[PDB]
């Protein structure tokens, strides 16, 4: 297990860790989060009590360094930082643990939710989407735009998701205009999988990362990317069986975790109805179709 200590909590804030949320009061004796499962990426996230504007947070992996959180009263936000003095860090964490000033990452015997939401997500790939090479962790917030949104503005603060555009020369082979538009297999398998992502694991990782940025920060361009990556698969007539089976599992856990109350703004009615009922893969996503029909039948 690993630990993300907090220097202090000077402003009242709702703190997220992965799929959990908890409240810290202004100047409450809070010094961090312990028992964080090694082996996964994690996200620690924030929504200030006095200005819900800007959810923000940090993607990190405890295997890569010793990280802590410290409020900056000038920039007005909780910042992640790396402590290079490993003995200083271990000494700090131990004191805070001895004084029980840390909330424990829950350990649940019957739940594998976070694994199932981050199975293909790697810190190395997050750091290529979120470019800030001098840190081992990655800052994301509500307002950050994607490279694709920026083509239709600060390049340093952008989400560099892979651009997917169905009416683009990359998507459509000269002389196969009808074929490629109505059956996106070429774009999926040759352009994206073989060409850009190299394998389906990297494709799923970006899809999963996009969903989590949509859900945890309300990041609109992230929701657009997540739906585009689903639609590209569902709109391809030729998809390897293992990718369809895995996609069904990925989406099932994503729909399962979605706050019931946010489905109106996180789910695109057109994409979902197309994917489940009209697309080539309309009969290949049994688990996802079942949870969608029982959880959000209005959307359909």
């Amino acid at each position: 297990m690993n630990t993300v200590p907090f220097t202090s909590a000077p402003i009242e804030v709702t703190i997220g860790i992965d799929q959990y949320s908890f409240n810290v009061k202004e100047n409450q004796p809070f010094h961090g989060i312990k028992d964080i499962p090694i082996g996964h990426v994690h996200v620690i996230h924030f929504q200030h009590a006095d200005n819900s504007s800007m959810r923000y947070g940090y993607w990190f992996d405890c295997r890569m360094g010793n990280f802590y959180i410290q409020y900056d009263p000038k920039d007005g936000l909780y910042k992640m930082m790396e402590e290079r003095d490993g003995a200083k860090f271990e000494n700090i964490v131990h004191n805070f643990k001895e004084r029980q000033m840390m909330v424990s990452y829950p350990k649940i015997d019957e739940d594998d939710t976070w694994y199932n939401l981050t199975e293909f997500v790697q810190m190395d790939k997050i750091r290529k989407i979120v470019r800030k090479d001098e840190n081992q962790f990655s800052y994301v917030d509500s307002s950050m735009t994607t490279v694709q949104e920026n083509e239709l503005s600060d390049p340093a603060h952008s989400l560099n998701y892979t651009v997917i555009n169905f009416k683009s020369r990359e998507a459509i082979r000269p002389g196969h205009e009808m074929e490629d538009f109505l059956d996106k297999s070429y774009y999926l398998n040759t352009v994206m999988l073989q060409g850009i992502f190299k394998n389906s694991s990297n494709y799923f990782g970006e899809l999963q990362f996009a969903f989590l940025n949509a859900m945890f920060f309300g990041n609109y361009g992230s929701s657009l990317q997540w739906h585009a990556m689903i639609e590209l698969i569902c709109s391809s007539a030729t998809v390897p069986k293992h990718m369809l089976d895995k996609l069904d599992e990925i989406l099932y856990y994503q729909i399962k975790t979605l706050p019931e109350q946010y489905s109106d703004i996180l789910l695109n009615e057109r994409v979902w109805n197309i994917c489940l009922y009209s697309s080539f893969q309309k009969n290949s996503l049994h688990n996802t179709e079942k949870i969608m029909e029982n959880k959000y039948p209005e959307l359909l």
């Binding site: 009416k167 683009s168 020369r169 459509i172 205009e177 009808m178 538009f181």
Partner: protein, 237 residues
């Protein structure tokens, strides 16, 4: 974006534009089979591509062989249309290529957009105008060349004959759409109006009769009467 009554004079400005109408590309007769099932037989069709400013009609004849062994022909027909318009554009000198292409049916937008990706500066637009270009096959000389084609062929016409010597393109388009609307509403009567006077003929190099200005005013009123007549017969008014 879309073209409608608010931006109608744009049709006659000096930016090159084309209307594309696909309603006569895929044409069939429905009939009974010996077993008493139903089957279609395709007949030759045409793409109706029109410069409203100049009258230049690019009539791409769609021969029935293009459907042989193909499935989902009504969908294929939109893509074949976009394929042929894109080929036409590429065949034109740069300074003749359109700045906008207006499709008369919104189902032509994505096919044409996809085929024109190489031309990002050509706007592909719908329209809220209900244009009567389906009636193009009621013009005898166009119907003749389509039905006689034995192979794919492009034929060029001026659908305005020599009217632009005497009237503006706005007025010429107004006449053309009134004639086509009438041919669409009651073809027999419209042709009777157009051809009831043997002394007014259609020149070999023309599509419509050689009416004087005063005779066009008469013809144009008879066409409006017919459209109003049929409107009464239709709704019992």
């Amino acid at each position: 974006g879309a073209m409608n009554s608010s931006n109608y004079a744009e049709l006659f400005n000096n930016d090159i534009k084309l209307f594309v109408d696909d309603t006569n590309v895929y044409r069939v007769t429905v009939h009974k089979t010996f077993e008493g099932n139903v089957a279609t037989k395709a007949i030759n069709g045409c793409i109706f591509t029109l410069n409203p400013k100049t009258g230049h009609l690019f009539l791409k004849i769609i021969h029935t062989s293009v459907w042989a062994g193909q499935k989902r022909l009504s969908q294929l027909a939109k893509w074949k249309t976009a394929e042929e318009v894109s080929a036409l554009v590429r065949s034109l000198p740069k300074e003749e290529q359109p700045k906008q292409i207006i499709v008369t049916r919104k189902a032509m937008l994505d096919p044409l957009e996809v085929h024109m990706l190489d031309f990002p500066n050509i706007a592909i637009r719908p329209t809220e105008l209900r244009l009567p270009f389906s009636a193009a096959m009621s013009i005898d000389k166009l119907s003749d060349v389509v039905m006689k084609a034995t192979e794919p062929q492009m034929v060029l016409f001026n659908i305005y004959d020599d009217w632009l010597d005497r009237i503006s393109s706005y007025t010429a388009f107004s006449r053309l759409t009134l004639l086509l609307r009438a041919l669409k509403t009651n073809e027999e009567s419209a042709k009777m109006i157009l051809l009831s006077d043997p002394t007014i003929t259609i020149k070999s190099y023309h599509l419509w009769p050689s009416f004087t200005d005063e005779q066009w005013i008469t013809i144009e009123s008879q066409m409006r009467d017919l459209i109003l007549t049929e409107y009464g017969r239709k709704y019992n008014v």
